[PDB]
Amino acid sequence: AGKIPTTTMGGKDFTFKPSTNVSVSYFTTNGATSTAGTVNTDYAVNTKNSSGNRVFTSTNNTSNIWYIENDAWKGKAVSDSDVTALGTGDVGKSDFSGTEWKS
Amino acid sequence: AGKIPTTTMGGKDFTFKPSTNVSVSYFTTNGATSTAGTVNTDYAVNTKNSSGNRVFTSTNNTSNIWYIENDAWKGKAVSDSDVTALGTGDVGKSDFSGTEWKS
Amino acid sequence: AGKIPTTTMGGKDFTFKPSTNVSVSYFTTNGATSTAGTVNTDYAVNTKNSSGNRVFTSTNNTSNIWYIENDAWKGKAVSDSDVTALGTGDVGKSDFSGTEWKS
Amino acid sequence: AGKIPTTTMGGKDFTFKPSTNVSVSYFTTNGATSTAGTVNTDYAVNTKNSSGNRVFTSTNNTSNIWYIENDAWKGKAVSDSDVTALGTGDVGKSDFSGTEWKS
Amino acid sequence: AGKIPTTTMGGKDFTFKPSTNVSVSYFTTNGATSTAGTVNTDYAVNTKNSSGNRVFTSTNNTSNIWYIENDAWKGKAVSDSDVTALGTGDVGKSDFSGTEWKS
Amino acid sequence: AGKIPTTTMGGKDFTFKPSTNVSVSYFTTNGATSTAGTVNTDYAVNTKNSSGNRVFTSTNNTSNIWYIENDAWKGKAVSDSDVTALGTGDVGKSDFSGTEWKS
Amino acid sequence: AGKIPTTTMGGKDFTFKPSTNVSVSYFTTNGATSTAGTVNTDYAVNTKNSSGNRVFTSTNNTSNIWYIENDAWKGKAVSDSDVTALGTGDVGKSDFSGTEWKS
Amino acid sequence: TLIELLIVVAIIGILAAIAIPQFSAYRVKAYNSAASSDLRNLKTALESAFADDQTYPPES
Amino acid sequence: TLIELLIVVAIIGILAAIAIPQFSAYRVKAYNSAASSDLRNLKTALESAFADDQTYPPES
Amino acid sequence: TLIELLIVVAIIGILAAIAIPQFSAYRVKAYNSAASSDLRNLKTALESAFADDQTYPPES
Fold it and tell me: What burial class does residue B32 get, using C-beta atoms within 10 Å of its C-beta: 0-12 exposed, 13-18 middle, 19+ buried?
C-alpha cells in the first residue's frame, strides 16, 4: 500500500510510470481494496527525487503543487518517515495553514 | 474588497486558487456584500505575474483576453495603482477604444 | 460587406467577437441590408488564422466543418482572393463534389 | 444497403451527415425499398469512430445508448464483421440479456 | 417493491428505462399488487445519480421537481436509508413545509 | 392581494403551482373577497422569471400572450412597480394600442 | 526498412533529422508500406552515437528512455546485430523484465 | 531544450485566448420560455376553474 | 551552456504549477441534470399510463 | 572548464527522461465521445422523420 497505483478500478492499467530516479507515494480513501464496488473520491500523492532536497505533493481538491524544501534530507525516498509527507488520512486537505507552501 | 472571491453566494466555496506567483484583482457590481439577496450580473477581473511585464484582464460581456504589456512595471502587483487595471466600475466594458488590445 | 456581422436584425448586438489573430468572412442572402423587413434564410461563413495554412468554412444547411489545407498561403487573410473561400452566392451548398472535404 | 439513409420516404432528404471520421451502419424492416407504400416501423443503428475502441448502437423501441467497448478492434469500421454490430434482423430488441450493456 | 415499475395494469410494458447510472425508487398506494382490479390513484417517485449529490423527487398531485442537495451522500443510491427519500406512504404530499424545496 | 390564487370559489384548491423561479401576479374584479356569493367575470395575470428580461401577461377576453421585453429590468419580480405590469383595473383589455405587443 | 522515416502517411515530410554522428533504427507494425490506407498503431525506435557505449530505445506505449550501456561495443551502429536493439516485432513492450533498465 | 520551452509558451498563449463567448442571452431566453409556458398553463387552470364555479377564483 | 540548463530548469518549474483546477463540481452538476431530466421524463410516462388504465402502474 | 562540461552532460541526461506519458487513451475517449454524440443526434433525426412519414426512412 501507499505506492503508485498500477491499475484503475475499471481493470485498465494505470498506464503511467515514474521518472528514472524519483520516489512516489500515493494514498486514497480505501487503500488498495480493488473490490470493484467502491469509489475513491479523493487522493493524496507526493513525489521526490532520491537525490533532491525537495518533496512535492498535491491532493484531489486543491490546485498548485505544494513543496517543503528542507535541505536536511538529500538521499531519502518518500517512503522514509523523516520526509513529512502526506500519509494515509488528510487526503483532501483543501487548505494549508503553516506546514507547506507554494503561494 | 477587490480580491479573488473565496465563496459564491450559494455558500459553496469559490473553489479556485491562483498560481504560485500571480497577483489577481476581481471586481463586481455589489462588491463583497454577501447579503444572500443580491445578484451580481457582471464582473471585471485582471491578473499579472509579479515578475511579468504583462497584465491580463477580462470582463463579463466580452470575449478574448485583453492585455497591456508595458515593460515599465516588472515587479509590481495588480494592487498597485500604476498598472492601469480595470478597477471598480467599468465592469461590463463590452467595447475597448484605445487603451488595451488583443485583436 | 462580407465581414462578421455586428448586430442581428432584432437590433441586438451579434454579441460575438473573433479570436486574437483569426480572419473571418461572412456572407448571407441579402448582404448588409438591415431593412427590418427581410429574412436571411441562409449563411456562408469561413475563418482562417492569419498564420495558419488552413481555411475553415461552413454553411447554413450543412453539418461538419469543411477545410482546404493548402500549404501555399500562410500569411494571408480570408479577404484575399487566392484563398478559394466561399464568397457571395453558393450560400447553401448542402453538398460538395470535389473542392473541399472533411469526411 | 445497411448504410445511413440519404432520403426519407416523403422524398425529403434525410438531412443529416455523420462526423468527420465515424462509421455508421443503419438497418430497418424493409431495407432500401423506397416503394412509396411501405412503413418501416423499426430501426437498428450503430456507429463507431474508425480510430475508436467502442461501437455504439441503439434501436427503435429502447432508451439509452448501448456500447460494447472491446479494445481488440481499433482501426475497423462498423462494416467489418468482427465488430459484433446489430445487423439486419433483431431490429427492435427492446431487451438485452448478456451481450451489450450501458446500465 | 419500491423500484421502477416494469408493466402497467393493462398488461402493457411500462416501456421506460432509466439513464446509465441513475438510481430510481417508486412507490404507490397498493404496492406491486397487480390484482387486475385495483386502482393506484397516487404515486411518489424519486431519482438520484449514483455519483450525484442531489436526490430529485415528485408526487402525483404536485407540480415542480423537489430536491434536497446534501453534499454528504455522494456515492449512495436511493435504496439507502440515509438519503431521506419519500418512502411508502406520504404518497400525495400536495404541500411541503420545511424539508425539501424547489421554489 | 394581487398574487396567485390558492383556492377557487367552490372551496377546491386552485391546484396549480408556479415554476421554480418565476414571479406571478394575478388580478380580478373583486380581489380576494371569497364571499361565496360573488362572480369574478374577468382576470388579468402576468408572469416573469426573476432572472428574465421579459414579462408575460394575458387577460380574460383576449387571445395570445403579450410581452414587453425591456432589457432594463433583469433581477426584478412582477411585484415591483418598474415592470409596467397590468395591475388592478384594466382587467379585460380586449385591445392593445401601443404599449405591449405579440402580433 | 528499419531506418528513420522520411515522410508520414499524410504525405508531409517526417521533418526531423538526426544528430551529426548518431545511428537511428526505427520499426513499426506495417514496415515501410505507405499504402495510404493502413494505420501504424505502435512504434519501436532506438538510437546510439557511433562512438558511444550506450544504446537508447523507447516504444509507443511506454514512458522513460531505456538504455543498455555495454562497454563492449564502442564503434558500432544500431544496424549491427551485436547491439541487442529492439528489432521488428516486440513493438509495444509496455513492460521490461530483465534485459534493459532505466528505473 | 530552451527552444522547446519557447514554443510551449507560444502555444499556451494561443490556447488561452480562443474567443470565449458570453453565455448570457442563451440562458435568459430559456428563462423567458419557462415563464411564458407557465403563463399559458395558468390560463388553462383559470378557465377550468371558471367552468367550475361560473367565476374566476378570488385573489390570494 | 550551464546557464541555458539553469533557465530550462527555471521554466520547467514555472510551467509545472499553473493552478490546475479541481473538476469535481463541474461534473456532479451534469450528473444532477441527468437525474432531474430522467425524473421529469418518468413523470410523463406515469401520467400517460394512468390515462390508459385509470390507475398508476403497480410497483416492480 | 571541463567540470562545467561534465555537469552540462549530467543535466542533459536528466532532462531527457522525465517520464513522458502515452497519449493513447486520452484521445480514444474523445473519439468515442464524438461517435456517441453523433448516434444520439441521429436518433433525433430518425424519430423526426418517422413523425413526418409514419415510417422510418429506407436504408441508403
Answer: exposed
